[PDB]
From a paper:
Microbial rhodopsins (MRs) are transmembrane light-sensitive proteins, found in Archaea, Bacteria, Eukaryota, and also viruses. MRs are composed of seven transmembrane α-helices (A–G) with the cofactor retinal covalently bound to the lysine residue of helix G via the Schiff base (RSB). Despite this paradigm, the first light-driven Na+ pump KR2 was identified in Krokinobacter eikastus in 20132. KR2 contains a characteristic for all known Na+-pumping rhodopsins (NaRs) set of N112, D116, Q123 residues in the helix C (NDQ motif).
Moreover, it was recently reported that in the ground state under physiological conditions (PDB ID: 6REW4) KR2 has a large water-filled cavity near the RSB (Schiff base cavity). This conformation of the protein was called ‘expanded’, and only occurs in the pentameric form of KR2. On the contrary, in the monomeric form the large cavity is absent, and the protein is in another conformation, called ‘compact’. Thus, we suggest that neutralization of D116 is the key determinant of the formation of the ‘compact’ conformation, which explains their structural similarity.
Author numbering: 2 to 6, 8 to 270, 272 to 273
The structure:
Amino acid sequence: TQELGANFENFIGATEGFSEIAYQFTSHILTLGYAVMLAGLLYFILTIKNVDKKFQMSNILSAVVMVSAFLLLYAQAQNWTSSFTFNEEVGRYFLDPSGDLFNNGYRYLNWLINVPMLLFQILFVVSLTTSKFSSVRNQFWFSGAMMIITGYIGQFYEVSNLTAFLVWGAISSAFFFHILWVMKKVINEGKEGISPAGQKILSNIWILFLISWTLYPGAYLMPYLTGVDGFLYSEDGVMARQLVYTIADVSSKVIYGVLLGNLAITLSNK
Ligand SMILES: *C/C=C(C)/C=C/C=C(C)/C=C/C1=C(C)CCCC1(C)C
Ligand code: NA
């Protein structure tokens, strides 16, 4: 009965361990992640004057997301290198008992804080038509909170009870679907009052949103996408999961923010 290896990262680290390549690749991608959030923070601060006052709350929410993402992705990166240590005998990296072990806390806290602000910020750039600001905001905030909480409950059972990990994943996915449905309505209403140039940016925001947000549940399932005896049920699934989370983070926070800023500028021409 394995005791030291809470999450799939710790499990692999405690059993098979990590190759020099898997350990170094993961450390570099997590470092890239926090480095891009810091670059983003400076970009959103320095370009805030490029949009009319009425849109600047969006630029502010982008900057605030970047502060929390930078700090918590920095903490996640340090957590990776501190949790696994090289054994000369076998020549791999194993879970270090003298460490605090890999912790999903940093990532899930990041999501809890930033999901509501990413959903909120579009409501300061587009105008609704038949929907109420307060109704859309409340739906986004409730569904967003329940999605991340149900997901967090799931992640605990990942190694101890796979079945529960999936059922909680499914409940989380139900809230996710409601978020996609609301955002699609917001984007369609936002297109009504604006130039074709603005409508085209909103079409690109929808595709970026749909893809980047679906990467999260994809990374959540990554180790189990080739079955329990599968090639992903390994350090390869851990590498893939951390890579996909980093791509999702850069896309859902930084690229999303840039596109909204670009939309605000096109509304700052007609
Ligand atoms: C910058 C961080 C963002 C936008 C985080 C978004 C996270 C999700 C959309 C997560 C959704 C999940 C599911 C739909 C099912 C599995 C568990 C989650 C929480 C990963
Ligand atoms: Na180490």
